[model samples]
Target: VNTIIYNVGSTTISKYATFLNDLRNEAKDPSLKCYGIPMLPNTNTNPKYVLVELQGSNKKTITLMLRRNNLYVMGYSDPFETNKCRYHIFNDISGTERQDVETTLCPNANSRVSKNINFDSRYPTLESKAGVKSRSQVQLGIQILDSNIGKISGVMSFTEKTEAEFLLVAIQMVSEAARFKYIENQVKTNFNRAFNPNPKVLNLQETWGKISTAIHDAKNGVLPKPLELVDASGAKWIVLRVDEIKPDVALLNYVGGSCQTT
Candidate 1:
């Protein structure tokens, strides 16, 4: 007789508790300098979705939200709409494949990682189906990346949808700290070198000061021609457009990037 094998599964509430704890711990980290931010509960009272904005460390700020489930199914948000909100869902190419050693503290498996879920911000109407009235609600989808366990990476854009602009920006989220570790490392390196040695103390403001300028420029819609962003490894990205929706959430439409440590 052949025997079947299966892995034991945990309840949603249990997993959610762990996720909340992770966020709390990250908030406490001195490097992130996150404060006064609300955390999700082990079990929500109601509502299928919840949006939370986390602002801290200047330009290093990140906006995070959660859904009851990890699917792209559209749902009703208003009584005026004839049907559920239409969503042209897309995920990261590096979302589920990996061969890098950077796998450390990947996002929870229940979390959904996606971008390009735009909704009408002007008004709710059954007509005017054109996307001219749309704006991306979730600027960048943050979640686990690749098959490698504990490897967290940010996902953006759709490769299959040729009609729309696609620029994949895979930012590295390491150790559940909710900070851009790869970019942080680069910034730290530059900071130390510019000032020369004596690396005893550092604060969030001091570390992320330079990045703030770039982000501020994006917010002011004053980007120089062919804005270039260099990662930890010195790879360059030419930014086409910058959508600074908020201080916490900004969408970078660019060319030449990777998951591959954006």
Candidate 2:
């Protein structure tokens, strides 16, 4: 039944800690501190097709959105779009298979988990509100797509005068996580199959095939002798290391590096 890691503890707040550790700290210059950033609690869910549980009455709306993901459809925005600023044709990956988990809260019956939906900015996003009576009356469940190519998805449901702060906090987490997965995957394909043999001459800011080739040449001490991208501080940029989650995608860090400067 797909993969789910329910109820991970946030060191600061409840297991359902709304904001990141430091965000709730309310410092004089919260931004100045590294700890205050709002973040999702760490878990094993593949950010791409993440399923989170809200504080209470969570199932109904959350589950409905989840349903959209599985049904090969999704909500839409824009005048011409079918969702007509609503959800109707939101399916992507073209989409998992999982059933409901009976718990003290809601039960998901044969619900699917996926990371395959492709949302266009042309379409507006979905939103939620406690039905003056029930917070659970919002949207239903989830979606995700995997292909020869990687995928991407994000959350902004509690958009505009959206839900309270905590839920808004989580969407950023979901969206960024999946976005990273998508970008990471693309970089992978660019390196493994896309950027091979005679590759492009790229700059520091460039990603995809161009950067892929440049790095290959850099590592091998080729390409006009180990070039790099620099920052405003004149810090040399180098591809320190790459550890791929998917063969086509990887994860790495960026730090100050030495330049082959004259």
Candidate 3:
């Protein structure tokens, strides 16, 4: 037999009485327990109810188990206004009538604990579609030294020509220097620091070799186009691509580097 008990404090009689009255009114079939106990001297004026004596105050825990097929009504009085009362139907397992559980104060058995439920039972079911989309929306910008170049605290600017020229010079210098094994090793070291382990360094070396072959071919009067040079102001630079520009200008991304005139 499932039993529901509400243990009220001795000083909280009026509050509990009001709660019970409201419960009885709304419950199609209400089951309740009412009794009292002694009031401590200089402490509580109201008679200490029996339930209150059984459940002492201050760091006390009470459990209420409702009847399997019945309704439980609970009510309480306003602390600031003694005359005002509030009631709630704690639970209605009978399914005979509907009752509103007004306040979060109703300490019911079911509401006391937390539970986890599994939603996926079928194969190939998307577990968290919204979460995946949210993660995917996170933009990945240019990174240098494993840090996002745009998020550094200092001032940063970039010109499209700077990137184009930098790539071109890097290619040319690597090609011209590759004749020496020491320079090739230096390029490899710089490449490892700049990029993660991948074909990036290998490809750079391969491209540099090809460019050298092309230049040599042109020197023989094949007439390959000359590489253009674009000088850029040496200052700190950060490169980033944004999805949409916002009107509010807050420096959201930056990286630090020194600038030079030459």
Candidate 4:
């Protein structure tokens, strides 16, 4: 499916109200399951969408926005991994013999912006002394119910940190892929001089080598410092502060690549 134009905005009371009202009206149609926020203080309206906003140190907030174009939630876990029961209803217009339609939600497309924070941590590794491996396991699942009152689509799980970091990597890979294609085309056009550009070849090999070495070091307990968001558009600048490594008992034996070891 093509990308949809999402309206980005901060979480506000009015926005929450609108989303809840939309879900309530959709639930009454008898085809959709309308669910409410499980643990929130206010449940005045039925919600069709779920937005999770996580606040980090120093007023840094990471916002996750979700919409139900033709989907709804069935159940999910809280921040503490406590199982919670929830439900939502929607129609299946695709006629694809499935219960519902599930789509991938990319956090990169959500107009991510931050201030004063050098780097945002995604899929962080936890090191608790209690033998509990809770690192990067925060999942948000959305269950889409169909019009026939049957379960057509499977539950879509969104790992708050993992997906966000993966999205960033995916975006970088896409850009690099385009560059590779462009270089390939240029070499094809200039076949005679292509082999003579040995410096370019070395540069590419050096780039790959640096990346590989960094990965190896990270796997061996070399931790990367916090990343700096250089641009407003998700451009990351890495800070090579490796001296401040705090060892975690839970993260032992887990191979972390550079900045992820912390």
Cα lDDT tens digits, model 3, 131-188, are 2322112221112211221221111233423222222222222221222232333333
lDDT of 4 by residue, 1-262 (tens): 2221112123333433343344333322223111111111112223433443323222222222223231222111112112211122122222421112222222232332111111232212211321224321321111100110111111234333333333222221121211232223323343332122223322332243233233335433443334222321334434343222211000011122323322
Candidate 1: residue 155 Cα off by (Å): 38
**Residue-wise C-alpha lDDT for candidate 1, range 1-262, written one tens digit per residue:** 0111111122233333344344334233122111122222222223323322222221122222323222111211111123222112222212322211011111233332223324321112211232223212212122211111111112132232211211111111221112223333332344312221111111221233233334434323444344444432335534533332123221111122121111
When summed lDDT is taken over every stretch of 10 residues in candidate 1, the lowest stretch is: 1-10
For candidate 2, report its TM-score: 0.24
State each model's CA lDDT, in order.
0.24, 0.24, 0.23, 0.25
Off by over 4 Å in 4: 1-8, 30-161, 164-262
lDDT of 4 at 239: 35
Model 1 ranges off by over 4 Å: 1-177, 181-209, 219-226, 230-235, 244-262
Give each prediction's root-mean-square deviation over alpha carbons. 20.0, 17.6, 34.2, 22.3
Q: Distance (Å) between predicted and true CA of 37, model 2? A: 23
TM-score of each: 0.19, 0.24, 0.14, 0.18
Clashes in candidate 4: how many? 10
Candidate 4 local Cα displacement, residue 19, angstroms: 1.2
Backbone clashes in model 1, listed as residue pairs: 106-150
The residue ranges of model 2 lying beyond 4 angstroms of the native Cα positions read 1-50, 56-89, 93-171, 175-236, 242-262
